[PDB]
Protein backbone atom coordinates (compact mmCIF):
# COMPACT_ATOMS: atom_id res chain seq x y z
CA UNK A 1 0.00 0.00 0.00
CA UNK A 2 1.01 3.66 0.37
CA UNK A 3 0.19 6.12 3.19
CA UNK A 4 1.07 9.83 3.78
CA UNK A 5 -0.12 12.91 5.73
CA UNK A 6 0.30 16.47 4.47
CA UNK A 7 -0.27 19.95 5.78
CA UNK A 8 0.13 23.50 4.53
CA UNK A 9 0.81 26.57 6.67
CA UNK A 10 -1.27 29.73 6.71
CA UNK A 11 -0.48 31.50 3.46
CA UNK A 12 1.13 28.39 1.92
CA UNK A 13 0.23 26.53 -1.25
CA UNK A 14 1.79 23.09 -1.83
CA UNK A 15 2.08 20.80 -4.83
CA UNK A 16 1.96 17.03 -4.24
CA UNK A 17 2.30 14.16 -6.65
CA UNK A 18 0.70 11.01 -5.31
CA UNK A 19 2.06 7.51 -6.00
CA UNK A 20 -0.30 6.97 -8.95
CA UNK A 21 0.80 10.23 -10.58
CA UNK A 22 -2.30 12.16 -9.57
CA UNK A 23 -1.43 15.78 -8.80
CA UNK A 24 -2.83 17.58 -5.76
CA UNK A 25 -2.46 21.20 -4.78
CA UNK A 26 -3.15 22.20 -1.18
CA UNK A 27 -4.25 25.71 -0.40
CA UNK A 28 -3.61 27.79 2.71
CA UNK A 29 -3.96 26.18 6.12
CA UNK A 30 -4.97 22.73 4.88
CA UNK A 31 -4.49 19.11 5.89
CA UNK A 32 -4.78 16.00 3.73
CA UNK A 33 -4.29 12.36 4.58
CA UNK A 34 -3.74 9.86 1.80
CA UNK A 35 -4.25 6.11 2.03
CA UNK A 36 -4.06 3.97 -1.10
CA UNK A 37 -5.26 0.40 -0.53
CA UNK A 38 -6.53 -2.46 -2.72
CA UNK A 39 -10.07 -1.04 -2.88
CA UNK A 40 -9.44 2.62 -3.51
CA UNK A 41 -7.20 5.62 -3.78
CA UNK A 42 -8.43 7.36 -0.62
CA UNK A 43 -7.90 11.03 0.07
CA UNK A 44 -9.22 12.49 3.33
CA UNK A 45 -9.46 16.27 3.43
CA UNK A 46 -9.33 17.03 7.14
CA UNK A 47 -8.92 20.82 6.84
CA UNK A 48 -8.92 23.51 4.17
CA UNK A 49 -8.93 23.22 0.41
CA UNK A 50 -7.35 21.19 -2.37
CA UNK A 51 -7.38 20.85 -6.15
CA UNK A 52 -7.04 17.51 -7.93
CA UNK A 53 -5.49 17.74 -11.41
CA UNK A 54 -3.99 15.34 -13.95
CA UNK A 55 -5.87 12.36 -12.55
CA UNK A 56 -4.24 9.02 -13.33
CA UNK A 57 -5.98 7.83 -16.52
CA UNK A 58 -5.80 4.09 -15.97
CA UNK A 59 -5.70 3.12 -12.34
CA UNK A 60 -8.27 0.37 -11.72
CA UNK A 61 -9.17 1.82 -8.28
CA UNK A 62 -11.58 4.70 -7.95
CA UNK A 63 -10.38 7.97 -6.49
CA UNK A 64 -12.34 8.94 -3.36
CA UNK A 65 -12.08 12.29 -1.60
CA UNK A 66 -13.78 12.12 1.79
CA UNK A 67 -14.61 14.84 4.23
CA UNK A 68 -16.63 14.67 7.40
CA UNK A 69 -19.66 15.45 5.21
CA UNK A 70 -19.30 12.67 2.67
CA UNK A 71 -17.51 11.31 -0.38
CA UNK A 72 -16.62 12.67 -3.81
CA UNK A 73 -15.96 9.86 -6.28
CA UNK A 74 -13.95 10.97 -9.29
CA UNK A 75 -14.28 9.82 -12.87
CA UNK A 76 -11.33 11.34 -14.73
CA UNK A 77 -12.09 14.64 -13.08
CA UNK A 78 -10.26 17.79 -12.22
CA UNK A 79 -11.97 19.37 -9.26
CA UNK A 80 -11.64 21.57 -6.19
CA UNK A 81 -12.80 20.57 -2.71
CA UNK A 82 -13.12 23.05 0.17
CA UNK A 83 -14.10 22.19 3.71
CA UNK A 84 -16.13 24.86 5.51
CA UNK A 85 -17.26 24.75 9.11
CA UNK A 86 -20.59 23.09 8.41
CA UNK A 87 -20.37 21.90 4.80
CA UNK A 88 -18.11 20.81 1.94
CA UNK A 89 -18.03 22.57 -1.45
CA UNK A 90 -16.97 20.85 -4.66
CA UNK A 91 -16.26 22.58 -7.97
CA UNK A 92 -15.72 20.52 -11.12
CA UNK A 93 -13.65 21.81 -14.05
CA UNK A 94 -13.16 18.66 -16.16
CA UNK A 95 -14.90 15.29 -16.18
CA UNK A 96 -17.48 14.37 -13.58
CA UNK A 97 -17.70 13.70 -9.85
CA UNK A 98 -20.30 11.71 -7.90
CA UNK A 99 -21.25 13.26 -4.56
CA UNK A 100 -22.27 10.87 -1.75
CA UNK A 101 -23.41 12.70 1.42
CA UNK A 102 -22.50 10.69 4.46
CA UNK A 103 -26.11 10.09 5.66
CA UNK A 104 -27.67 9.85 2.18
CA UNK A 105 -25.02 8.34 -0.07
CA UNK A 106 -27.40 6.78 -2.59
CA UNK A 107 -28.47 8.05 -5.05
CA UNK A 108 -25.27 9.90 -5.79
CA UNK A 109 -25.48 13.47 -7.01
CA UNK A 110 -23.65 13.80 -10.32
CA UNK A 111 -21.62 16.96 -10.83
CA UNK A 112 -20.30 17.72 -14.31
CA UNK A 113 -17.76 20.27 -15.41
CA UNK A 114 -18.72 23.88 -14.83
CA UNK A 115 -20.78 22.90 -11.77
CA UNK A 116 -20.32 23.75 -8.10
CA UNK A 117 -22.19 22.24 -5.13
CA UNK A 118 -22.20 22.49 -1.35
CA UNK A 119 -23.33 19.63 0.86
CA UNK A 120 -23.35 18.48 4.44
CA UNK A 121 -23.83 15.04 5.96
CA UNK A 122 -27.57 15.11 5.28
CA UNK A 123 -27.37 16.25 1.64
CA UNK A 124 -27.17 19.06 -0.97
CA UNK A 125 -27.29 22.68 0.28
CA UNK A 126 -26.70 24.60 -2.91
CA UNK A 127 -25.62 24.16 -6.48
CA UNK A 128 -24.81 26.45 -9.37
CA UNK A 129 -22.90 26.91 -12.59
CA UNK A 130 -19.39 28.38 -12.72
CA UNK A 131 -17.37 29.52 -15.73
CA UNK A 132 -13.94 29.19 -14.15
CA UNK A 133 -11.69 26.55 -15.74
CA UNK A 134 -9.53 26.25 -12.56
CA UNK A 135 -9.73 27.72 -9.09
CA UNK A 136 -8.23 31.19 -8.89
CA UNK A 137 -6.17 30.34 -5.77
CA UNK A 138 -4.30 27.64 -7.66
CA UNK A 139 -2.90 30.33 -9.94
CA UNK A 140 -2.06 32.63 -7.04
CA UNK A 141 -5.16 34.81 -7.25
CA UNK A 142 -8.43 35.78 -5.58
CA UNK A 143 -11.24 36.68 -8.01
CA UNK A 144 -14.35 38.50 -6.90
CA UNK A 145 -17.44 39.01 -9.05
CA UNK A 146 -19.75 41.20 -7.03
CA UNK A 147 -18.97 39.22 -3.89
CA UNK A 148 -20.39 40.60 -0.64
CA UNK A 149 -17.63 42.22 1.38
CA UNK A 150 -18.16 40.08 4.47
CA UNK A 151 -17.68 36.91 2.38
CA UNK A 152 -14.73 38.33 0.47
CA UNK A 153 -12.89 39.18 3.67
CA UNK A 154 -13.77 35.76 5.21
CA UNK A 155 -11.99 34.21 2.25
CA UNK A 156 -9.00 36.56 2.35
CA UNK A 157 -8.52 36.02 6.09
CA UNK A 158 -7.73 32.34 5.42
CA UNK A 159 -4.41 33.52 3.97
CA UNK A 160 -3.47 35.68 6.96
CA UNK A 161 -2.62 35.21 10.61
CA UNK A 162 -4.75 38.06 11.95
CA UNK A 163 -8.42 38.91 12.11
CA UNK A 164 -10.05 40.80 9.24
CA UNK A 165 -13.57 42.20 9.53
CA UNK A 166 -15.88 44.91 8.32
CA UNK A 167 -18.45 47.02 10.04
CA UNK A 168 -21.95 45.46 9.70
CA UNK A 169 -23.08 48.49 7.67
CA UNK A 170 -20.68 47.33 4.96
CA UNK A 171 -21.40 43.61 4.99
CA UNK A 172 -23.22 43.45 1.66
CA UNK A 173 -21.09 45.89 -0.32
CA UNK A 174 -20.10 44.21 -3.55
CA UNK A 175 -16.47 43.52 -4.31
CA UNK A 176 -15.24 43.09 -7.88
CA UNK A 177 -11.72 42.48 -9.08
CA UNK A 178 -8.71 40.21 -9.33
CA UNK A 179 -6.15 40.09 -6.55
CA UNK A 180 -2.67 38.51 -6.51
CA UNK A 181 -2.22 36.57 -3.29
CA UNK A 182 1.50 37.56 -3.10
CA UNK A 183 0.65 40.67 -1.06
CA UNK A 184 -2.53 40.61 0.95
CA UNK A 185 -1.96 44.10 2.43
CA UNK A 186 -2.24 45.46 -1.12
CA UNK A 187 -5.54 43.62 -1.55
CA UNK A 188 -6.99 45.24 1.57
CA UNK A 189 -5.74 48.68 0.57
CA UNK A 190 -7.12 48.38 -2.98
CA UNK A 191 -10.57 47.14 -1.92
CA UNK A 192 -10.80 49.84 0.77
CA UNK A 193 -9.92 52.53 -1.77
CA UNK A 194 -12.43 51.25 -4.33
CA UNK A 195 -15.22 51.04 -1.76
CA UNK A 196 -14.23 54.38 -0.18
CA UNK A 197 -13.63 52.81 3.21
CA UNK A 198 -11.27 53.44 6.13
CA UNK A 199 -8.89 50.69 7.28
CA UNK A 200 -8.68 50.57 11.08
CA UNK A 201 -5.50 48.81 12.11
CA UNK A 202 -4.74 49.64 15.72
CA UNK A 203 -3.11 46.36 16.64
CA UNK A 204 -1.24 44.10 14.23
CA UNK A 205 -3.66 41.21 14.13
CA UNK A 206 -6.97 43.06 14.12
CA UNK A 207 -8.06 44.94 10.98
CA UNK A 208 -11.54 46.43 10.51
CA UNK A 209 -12.95 48.08 7.42
CA UNK A 210 -15.10 51.07 8.37
CA UNK A 211 -17.25 53.78 6.73
CA UNK A 212 -15.30 56.95 5.87
CA UNK A 213 -16.02 60.25 7.60
Amino acid sequence: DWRADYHSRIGEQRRLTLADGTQVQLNTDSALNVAFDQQARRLRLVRGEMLITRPALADSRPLWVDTEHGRLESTLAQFNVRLHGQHTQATVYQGSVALQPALHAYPPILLGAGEQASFNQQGLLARQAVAAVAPAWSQGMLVAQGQPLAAFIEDLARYRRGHLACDPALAGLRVSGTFPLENTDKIIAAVAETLQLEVQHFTRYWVTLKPRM
Binding site: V143, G177, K186, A190
Partner: protein, 80 residues
Protein backbone atom coordinates in the same frame (compact mmCIF):
# COMPACT_ATOMS: atom_id res chain seq x y z
CA UNK B 1 4.23 44.04 -19.70
CA UNK B 2 2.34 41.74 -22.09
CA UNK B 3 0.09 38.71 -21.95
CA UNK B 4 -1.66 36.27 -24.23
CA UNK B 5 -5.42 36.68 -24.15
CA UNK B 6 -8.30 34.57 -25.42
CA UNK B 7 -11.42 36.24 -24.07
CA UNK B 8 -14.64 35.69 -25.99
CA UNK B 9 -17.28 38.32 -26.57
CA UNK B 10 -19.86 38.39 -23.79
CA UNK B 11 -20.91 40.23 -20.64
CA UNK B 12 -18.21 42.59 -19.38
CA UNK B 13 -18.05 41.54 -15.74
CA UNK B 14 -16.98 37.90 -16.36
CA UNK B 15 -14.67 39.05 -19.13
CA UNK B 16 -12.84 41.32 -16.65
CA UNK B 17 -12.50 38.42 -14.17
CA UNK B 18 -10.91 36.49 -17.03
CA UNK B 19 -8.70 39.44 -18.04
CA UNK B 20 -7.28 40.10 -14.59
CA UNK B 21 -6.45 36.42 -14.19
CA UNK B 22 -4.77 36.18 -17.62
CA UNK B 23 -2.74 39.37 -16.92
CA UNK B 24 -2.11 38.41 -13.25
CA UNK B 25 -2.84 41.94 -12.07
CA UNK B 26 -4.46 43.67 -9.15
CA UNK B 27 -7.60 45.05 -10.72
CA UNK B 28 -10.21 46.62 -8.44
CA UNK B 29 -13.25 48.70 -9.43
CA UNK B 30 -16.88 49.31 -8.38
CA UNK B 31 -19.26 46.41 -9.18
CA UNK B 32 -21.99 48.78 -10.36
CA UNK B 33 -19.72 50.34 -12.97
CA UNK B 34 -19.43 47.10 -15.01
CA UNK B 35 -22.84 45.45 -14.37
CA UNK B 36 -24.90 44.96 -17.53
CA UNK B 37 -22.26 45.85 -20.09
CA UNK B 38 -20.72 43.87 -22.91
CA UNK B 39 -17.40 43.40 -24.63
CA UNK B 40 -16.40 42.20 -28.07
CA UNK B 41 -13.65 40.32 -26.28
CA UNK B 42 -9.88 40.20 -26.63
CA UNK B 43 -7.93 37.61 -28.59
CA UNK B 44 -4.19 37.94 -29.12
CA UNK B 45 -0.97 39.10 -27.50
CA UNK B 46 -1.09 42.63 -26.08
CA UNK B 47 0.53 45.05 -23.66
CA UNK B 48 -1.73 44.79 -20.60
CA UNK B 49 -2.78 48.46 -20.77
CA UNK B 50 -3.58 48.24 -24.52
CA UNK B 51 -5.40 44.95 -24.02
CA UNK B 52 -7.58 46.40 -21.30
CA UNK B 53 -8.45 49.40 -23.50
CA UNK B 54 -9.43 47.03 -26.35
CA UNK B 55 -11.57 44.90 -24.02
CA UNK B 56 -13.34 48.06 -22.89
CA UNK B 57 -14.10 49.35 -26.41
CA UNK B 58 -17.71 50.41 -26.66
CA UNK B 59 -18.38 50.07 -22.95
CA UNK B 60 -18.18 53.72 -21.91
CA UNK B 61 -15.34 52.83 -19.51
CA UNK B 62 -11.54 53.31 -19.47
CA UNK B 63 -8.65 51.86 -17.44
CA UNK B 64 -7.19 53.85 -14.55
CA UNK B 65 -3.94 53.56 -12.58
CA UNK B 66 -2.14 55.57 -9.92
CA UNK B 67 1.06 55.47 -7.87
CA UNK B 68 0.79 51.78 -6.87
CA UNK B 69 0.83 48.90 -9.33
CA UNK B 70 -2.95 48.49 -9.19
CA UNK B 71 -5.50 48.96 -11.95
CA UNK B 72 -9.01 50.41 -11.67
CA UNK B 73 -11.79 51.42 -14.10
CA UNK B 74 -13.67 54.64 -14.56
CA UNK B 75 -16.21 56.18 -16.91
CA UNK B 76 -14.48 57.40 -20.10
CA UNK B 77 -12.88 60.80 -19.66
CA UNK B 78 -14.50 63.80 -21.26
CA UNK B 79 -12.47 65.17 -24.18
CA UNK B 80 -13.63 68.78 -24.16
Amino acid sequence: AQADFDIPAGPLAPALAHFGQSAHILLSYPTALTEGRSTSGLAGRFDIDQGLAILLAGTGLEASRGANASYSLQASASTG
